[PDB]
Amino acid sequence: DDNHLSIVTLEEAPFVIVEDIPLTETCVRNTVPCRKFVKINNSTNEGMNVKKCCKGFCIDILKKLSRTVKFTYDLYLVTNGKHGKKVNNVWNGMIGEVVYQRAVMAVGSLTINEERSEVVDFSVPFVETGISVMVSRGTQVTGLSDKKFQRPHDYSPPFRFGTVPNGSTERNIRNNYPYMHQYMTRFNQRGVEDALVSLKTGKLDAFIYDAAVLNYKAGRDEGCKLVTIGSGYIFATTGYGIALQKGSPWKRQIDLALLQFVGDGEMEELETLWLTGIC
Amino acid sequence: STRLKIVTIHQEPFVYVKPTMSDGTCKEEFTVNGDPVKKVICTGPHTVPQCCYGFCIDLLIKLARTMNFTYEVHLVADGKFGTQERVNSNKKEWNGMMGELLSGQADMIVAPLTINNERAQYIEFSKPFKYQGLTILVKKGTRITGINDPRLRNPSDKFIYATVKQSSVDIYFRRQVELSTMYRHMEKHNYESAAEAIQAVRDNKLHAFIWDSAVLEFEASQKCDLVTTELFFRSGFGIGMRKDSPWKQNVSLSILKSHENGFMEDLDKTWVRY
Numbered sequence: 001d002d003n004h005l006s007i008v009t010l011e012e013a014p015f016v017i018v019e020d021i022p023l024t025e026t027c028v029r030n031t032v033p034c035r036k037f038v039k040i041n042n043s044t045n046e047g048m049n050v051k052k053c054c055k056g057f058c059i060d061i062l063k064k065l066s067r068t069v070k071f072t073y074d075l076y077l078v079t080n081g082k083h084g085k086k087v088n089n090v091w092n093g094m095i096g097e098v099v100y101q102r103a104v105m106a107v108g109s110l111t112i113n114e115e116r117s118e119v120v121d122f123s124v125p126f127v128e129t130g131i132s133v134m135v136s137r138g139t140q141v142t143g144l145s146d147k148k149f150q151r152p153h154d155y156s157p158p159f160r161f162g163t164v165p166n167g168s169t170e171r172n173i174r175n176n177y178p179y180m181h182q183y184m185t186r187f188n189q190r191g192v193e194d195a196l197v198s199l200k201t202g203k204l205d206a207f208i209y210d211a212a213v214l215n216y217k218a219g220r221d222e223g224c225k226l227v228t229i230g231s232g233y234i235f236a237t238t239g240y241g242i243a244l245q246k247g248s249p250w251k252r253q254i255d256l257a258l259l260q261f262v263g264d265g266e267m268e269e270l271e272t273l274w275l276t277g278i279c
Numbered sequence: 280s281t282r283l284k285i286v287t288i289h290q291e292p293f294v295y296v297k298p299t300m301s302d303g304t305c306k307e308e309f310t311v312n313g314d315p316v317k318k319v320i321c322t323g324p325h326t327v328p329q330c331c332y333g334f335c336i337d338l339l340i341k342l343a344r345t346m347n348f349t350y351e352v353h354l355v356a357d358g359k360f361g362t363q364e365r366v367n368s369n370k371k372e373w374n375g376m377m378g379e380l381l382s383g384q385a386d387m388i389v390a391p392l393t394i395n396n397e398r399a400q401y402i403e404f405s406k407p408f409k410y411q412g413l414t415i416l417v418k419k420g421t422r423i424t425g426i427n428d429p430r431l432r433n434p435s436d437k438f439i440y441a442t443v444k445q446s447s448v449d450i451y452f453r454r455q456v457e458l459s460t461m462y463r464h465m466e467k468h469n470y471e472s473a474a475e476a477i478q479a480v481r482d483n484k485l486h487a488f489i490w491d492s493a494v495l496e497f498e499a500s501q502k503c504d505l506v507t508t509e510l511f512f513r514s515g516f517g518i519g520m521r522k523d524s525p526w527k528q529n530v531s532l533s534i535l536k537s538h539e540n541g542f543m544e545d546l547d548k549t550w551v552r553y
């Protein structure tokens with residue numbers, strides 16, 4: 001049965017939203033069935049498969065792809081890692097699932113990058129992202145490469161700006177802008193939430209983070225005072241893509257389909273439906 | 280085998296075209312910020328050697344060094360990007376850079392080449408080396424809201440807007456039946472090249488020019504009697520190869536790496552923002 005496809009995803013609102021399975025034992029409305037292997041406790045490999053319901057921007061894409069490319073799927077949430085990291089020569093998360101042939105595709109908020117592209121193929125990008133900057137309206141900067149960030153002791157008062165550490169933003173900044181990275185560690189933020197308040201309460205002048213995340217939160221700010229820079233200033237621009245197995249027979253049609261969606265306007269509808277906010 | 284024919288097109292700031300000197304070489308010069316301008320010879324339209332430099336030439340050079348291939352560059356003979364047209368009778372045919380790549384007159388398109396379904400049917404695109412989109416250019420003082428403006432949506436010969444003939448934007452408007460009204464206004468006024476359209480706006484012989492923002496925002500920055508709208512559509516430029524290219528994987532890996540280590544940032548600063 002070559003046309004029923006194992007497909008892996010990962011909870012990450014609003015691209016993928018997981019909900020329980022309600023009254024009737026079936027997924028309804030705009031959601032699709034997705035299974036999750038739910039661990040017994042935190043000290044074990046033991047677990048149980050549980051039927052969940054998934055929806056969101058990427059799920060609508062999956063729905064649109066399934067109807068157009070004509071395939072069916074058993075969708076499941078990855079439990080071993082998140083998006084994907086090489087750990088002790090081994091890929092975990094969604095990437096790994098694809099690499100070790102448990103999934104034909106990964107669908108979710110998965111960033112296209114060089115390293116991953118070595119072991120999986122990617123579709124064309126279907127959401128633009130990269131490293132961006134958020135400020136309180138008024139505050140003047142361009143993107144990451146602004147001197148106010150690179151040499152912040154050239155200006156008075158010096159900018160205060162940070163990121164959420166331990167992720168790809170910090171790691172990119174540390175590899176491209178060593179001193180800026182050294183400088184902003186004292187301004188680190190534990191979460192995206194804490195960063196936004198840090199911005200709103202003047203304890204931070206600039207939040208440096210993932211483009212797609214920042215646009216989304218800016219669209220939903222109570223007061224519309226938190227604003228992201230122009231897209232022309234996004235640094236290390238890239239996109240979310242669907243990961244496929246190297247040399248997959250599906251990539252061409254998935255590519256052509258996604259490009260059809262963009263061309264036809266369907267993608268903008270979707271971004272308006274799920275990502276566009278009031279601001 | 281290892282010597283690639285490169286086709287490209289005149290499109291500032293991604294590609295500059297200038298004459299060679301007397302001795303058939305290129306005048307050495309530096310960027311406003313002091314970087315050496317890398318230049319290559321490029322034959323073009325009857326045909327004659329010229330100088331090419333810019334964003335896409337710098338990208339070609341990094342590709343050529345990274346994957347270790349040699350190259351020869353020429354300008355597309357018909358001056359166009361590439362749309363698909365019925366031959367007349369059954370057979371359809373690509374013009375512009377697309378046709379030259381498909382015919383074998385070129386091995387690789389290095390140019391601000393828009394990625395789209397239409398083209399991706401018949402060729403392999405790399406991952407985007409540039410993300411941008413579509414916007415509108417007007418003389419300062421012309422009042423237009425964007426692609427939904429009534430003077431645009433209910434067109435008449437009293438306000439003329441146009442794009443570049445046999446381009447991705449031409450395709451974009453020909454593509455959807457809801458844009459039908461807009462298209463056979465445009466088809467009556469479309470221009471042979473971006474340069475001639477931009478000029479025609481300044482001369483007030485063209486009221487609005489619909490085109491790539493990475494080009495239009497550059498123009499508006501060098502020419503202050505010109506302004507743009509708002510991106511009404513998002514799209515990317517990619518390297519164009521034939522389906523069988525052994526180079527496709529490494530071209531894309533190279534572009535991703537260049538985004539991630541700030542090489543693209545360097546290029547974007549040098550050419551696209553100034």
Ligand SMILES: N[C@@H](Cc1cc(-c2ccc(Cl)cc2Cl)cc(CP(=O)(O)O)c1O)C(=O)O
Pocket residue numbers: 012013014083084109110111112164166167168169170192209210213
């Ligand atoms: N796209 C990435 C995963 C990834 C996801 C997010 C994210 C965070 C909050 C919210 Cl609400 C939504 C999202 Cl999508 C942020 C980063 C930014 P950082 O790592 O520096 O923590 C990231 O990398 C990948 O494919 O590995």
